[PDB]
């Protein structure tokens, strides 16, 4: 087993960015050795303008690891206008410091196609169904997926969404899975798979409805 401290810097969720209009980026540092003193996570902007107060999270892992994150709120204007943000990671016994940077992903634009499906009743548990959603052919790859029942958004933990994979063409695709209960679809057989994506017009949203019953 190897231990190589690595760092990851995320772009804002399209949902946070376009819907909540309170985007944040996150610097994630994995595989740290606990109690080796504290790691410094330092935020900066390429333009040299001030960064907000960030939130730092530490959590020991059942693998002896220490995981550290810093979440920085960014200006919607600043992000969409292409500010570049850098996370710098400083450590005691650390050879060279870690630097990740992030900026709005540019390249051609492409709206997502959203298709939603219900599984037929499978033997055993017939008090459960699975909703699934294919969103594809969007670019760039930054996308938010959510499910609604009765027009109200479910907790993100209810569903699983895949990582954007390249389609055979220029775009990306993603799958979302949402297990549901008889209680739910019976009180109203209305579910929506919603995507948030910069290229979707208007208002950066595309959604599709699906019912357990045809």
């Amino acid at each position: 087993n190897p231990r190589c401290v690595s760092a990851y810097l995320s772009r804002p969720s399209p949902f946070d960015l376009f819907i909540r209009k309170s985007p944040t980026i996150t610097c994630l540092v994995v595989d740290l050795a606990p109690s080796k003193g504290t790691v410094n996570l330092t935020w900066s902007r390429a333009s040299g303008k001030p960064v907000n107060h960030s939130t730092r999270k530490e959590e020991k892992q059942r693998n002896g690891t220490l995981t550290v994150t810093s979440t920085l709120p960014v200006g919607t204007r600043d992000w969409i206008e292409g500010e570049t943000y850098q996370c710098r990671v400083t450590h005691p016994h650390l050879p060279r410091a870690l630097m990740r940077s992030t900026t709005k992903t540019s390249g051609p634009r492409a709206a997502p196609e959203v298709y939603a499906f219900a599984t037929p009743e499978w033997p055993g548990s017939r008090d459960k169904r699975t909703l699934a959603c294919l969103i594809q052919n969007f670019m760039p790859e930054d996308i938010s997926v959510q499910w609604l029942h009765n027009e109200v958004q479910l907790p993100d933990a209810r569903h699983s969404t895949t990582q954007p994979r390249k389609t055979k063409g220029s775009g990306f695709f993603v799958f979302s899975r949402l297990e549901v209960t008889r209680a739910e679809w019976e009180q109203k057989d209305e579910f929506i798979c919603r995507a948030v994506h910069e290229a979707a017009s208007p208002s950066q949203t595309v959604q599709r409805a699906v019912s357990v019953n045809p």
Binding site: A46, S47, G48, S101
Partner: peptide
């Protein structure tokens, strides 16, 4: 913000 590319190089 007064910054010439030699800055924007040194950044990275």
């Amino acid at each position: 913000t007064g910054r010439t590319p030699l800055h924007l190089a040194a950044w990275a």
